[model samples]
Target chain A: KPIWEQIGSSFINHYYQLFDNDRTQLGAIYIDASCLTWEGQQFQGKAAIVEKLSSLPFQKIQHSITAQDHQPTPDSCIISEVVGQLKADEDPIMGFHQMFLLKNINDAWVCTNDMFRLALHNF
Target chain B: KPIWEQIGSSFINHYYQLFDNDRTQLGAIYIDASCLTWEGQQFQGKAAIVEKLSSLPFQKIQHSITAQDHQPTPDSCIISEVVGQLKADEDPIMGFHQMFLLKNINDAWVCTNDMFRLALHNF
Candidate 1:
């Protein structure tokens, strides 16, 4: 119902679309210095981000979003957190959580920072 | 340190101060509908966020930051990630990680969203 929530939906929709397709295109959303934390590994810059995604072990990756929440800041900046499962290569679904800082620049919502972590499966 | 990094440092300094002192000071930076994901429980709005914080089981909470990174976006918005250890009630220090989205309002930075997670100690 809120603008921030609406933007979150749109971002997830557009992100996953490219995620399942060409990761190189993700640069369009992430700027040169966007920071990413995947599990415990950290990466900075679009080149590094793209390189990491391109080298993922899985050929097919799918995500199921379980929950999403947002906080809207002044000047079209929004912070959102999402929890989901990442299913890859027909392997066990890995519980994943991500936080994104999005800014509307030139009428497009672009990710400023993205941090991700996978829940350990070992019980 | 970059300007964004300096801001991040200042934020952490002020945040942990209030965090150790009076959590009510947190409300001054976080507005209504600000979302927080602590451990796994999610809270929306300052009221819910503050209530959950005040109810933490620990009588004394302390955070020690080990690493921090930031990405500054257009329009003076920045997103940062911090890794650290959290110690409560003399228990073994637990790993902690947090991400924050901050915006500059007339040069003073305020947090828009904050997400915190406790590291799995089982590993």
Candidate 2:
């Protein structure tokens, strides 16, 4: 149904906006089953997710998505992947990627499994 | 036996050192067929990959991995996911995410597909 190709742009753009401000607004998009794996630490539920976002050490952060892909799995599960760049201050942009297992529950898109990482060239 | 749980740290750490130093060294890990999706822009082959990293607007970049996971897929492909925080300077740490498709080519570990992004909350 072109979940990632069609409606994904606005969804991602809207996410980064709220991420810069009141993260609590995210509660409207998440629910009890919402799961997030930041770096490696894992958290569940909307409140926990909000708290985690609020605790980010950096401020005035911005995200710019470069690529998006999705696969519609069974039982209405959508596997969504995204790659992008981020800016925390005036310069020095960082690369990142995120994957989400999303579904339409109650007429809204909520992430079930969200994983993120940095683009580091390791030896 | 646990691919992500073992040996991954060394591999990733080494990657960052190479990334910060001689980008051309990346050719040792990625072959001519390597592919990279930087922020959504896709580039194929080792030379192109190095060019993209070098052309980044900001210099003196650093990457800190926070999480990494891997799973074996069909046809001997290993899907690896990583999350971390990156710093362009002294402050303004940006969160990032990356995923890699790895395979052992000719008795050496090499990246096949790489995607990266930043963690930003958008409106």
Candidate 3:
């Protein structure tokens, strides 16, 4: 598999881990809502995010990355336009957008930041 | 404008300056192709990218970030799922996806890295 594909797959996998309450893999991806309409809601860092996700009452959640675009920089790449379908208890949560900032650390790509915009219908 | 929208708009503006041969503002955003399918094509740094974009024959290019998801981290946010329309000579170049990795620099957001995937139809 291509390195880009691997990086892309990692992103999808991490999202699943997060939604599944898999804290072991959760801390790696950081969520920022500052750019969100709900900014200044006091949600910051990994712990706060974990609490937020945990509070949501969803049974059987699944998300898939439908499409993505990658732009490479000096030591990092921006992965964007990723679309996904999230289902909770057989109900659709509307497709959402995800952006991942990955860095080439010691020849391995690590996700440095992650931001997502959920569809308004889901809100 | 909201800070995130301002940040998002900046990403589009920088992309235009790059395609227009405007080096005065081009050096700020870096492009990394390492995670790209054409990763080892010898294109690195801003100068190489400028040469590549200049080589393309496109007239009247416009790109807009249709939808975005922002995930904020400690000092940065991942801006993803950005879609844009690019036209060359009034001909469609296919919609493209752009991922912008931005950081909160001095209380302002600046794009640190940009990666984009052009739809295969445009390739």
Candidate 4:
């Protein structure tokens, strides 16, 4: 696998693990300039992103990744997209898509941009 | 709005217009190094990407974008994710997600990486 793919895969695994186990730790993967869009609601900065994530209504959630694609950008960032299924608390399994732009800061991959949406027919 | 936002917005609109009209024109937005992941299949190079898109099984399709998020990367690239509903031929409307890594070459935004997936629960 390419280095970007390896890094992207590792980051995705670590990210979801932290999200599923202790979402508080997810702050380590973001910075003050990070931005996240969840179901069309936008959150900027690490504090806001973590707050939004930590306050999700689900008590327990598991993400099963169906597919992922990663690429290396000219600016040396890693861009990744993941399609998966998630089950939260008593809710049925729902399909979801997430994309992330990651940059290496001090040898650590930090998320700069993140967007997520649940797959559903809205119109 | 930021310059990046303006560029990203314009690119999205132009991209989908060509996609819904004449996908063959999409070749103008990609380079020889471009890569595309459609569903789980991978296509490399602009020729392959255009071929894959032009050969889609559907004859008529319309895309209804639900939401999109865009960010400027450190390397001067734009990372974007779009969530939308698509109707192909006589098939039922289906939710989909697509992500792109775009870079400006000669003042033109060209896609370096693209990933697309139909939001469906497989497991």
DockQ of each: 0.29, 0.05, 0.20, 0.34
What local lDDT score does residue B25 receive in model 4, on the 0 to 100 scale?
88
Native-vs-model 3 lDDT?
0.52
Candidates 1 and 2, the one with greater lDDT: 1
Residues B2-113 of candidate 4 have per-residue lDDT tens digits of: 6777888788888899999889989999998888889778888889999999999888888888778777765678778877888888987787777888899998999988
Candidate 1 per-residue lDDT, tens place, B1-123, comes to 778778877887789888877766777777664667787566877788888887888888888887666766656677777767889987988877677877766466777678887765211
Worst 10 residues of 3 chain A by lDDT: A31-40
* Candidate 2: residue A20 lDDT (0-100): 62
Write down the lDDT of every candidate, Cα atoms only.
Answer: 0.75, 0.66, 0.52, 0.84
Per-residue lDDT of candidate 2, residues B17-46 (tens digit): 888766657788887877687766777788
Task: List the lowest-lDDT window of 10 residues for candidate 4 chain A.
Answer: A114-123
How accurate locally is residue B66 in candidate 4, as Cα lDDT from 0 to 100? 79
lDDT of 1 by residue, A1-123 (tens): 677778888898789889877676888888775777676577787888888988888788888887676667656677777767777887876777677878776787888778776665523
Model with the higher lDDT, candidate 2 or 3: 2
- Residues A1-123 of candidate 2 have per-residue lDDT tens digits of 445445555566667788766565766666676767676676656678778877877757788787676544324454558667778867588776677656677788776556776654220
Per residue, candidate 3 scores C-alpha lDDT tens digits across B1-123 of 445556666665665656554434455554333222121233455556556555556655555555544444434453533555566666755656555556555564455555555554443
Residue A111, model 1, lDDT: 80
Could you tell me how far off, in angstroms, the CA of residue A43 lies in candidate 4 after the best superposition? Answer: 1.5
lDDT of 1 at B3: 83
Model 1, stretches more than 4 Å misplaced? Answer: A32-48, A90-92, A120-123, B1-3, B28-68, B82-97, B116-123
Give the TM-score ranking, best first.
4, 1, 3, 2
Better model by DockQ, 1 or 4? 4
TM-score, candidate 3, first chain: 0.61
Give the worst 10-residue stretch by lDDT in candidate 3 chain B: B33-42
Q: Which model scores highest in lDDT?
A: 4
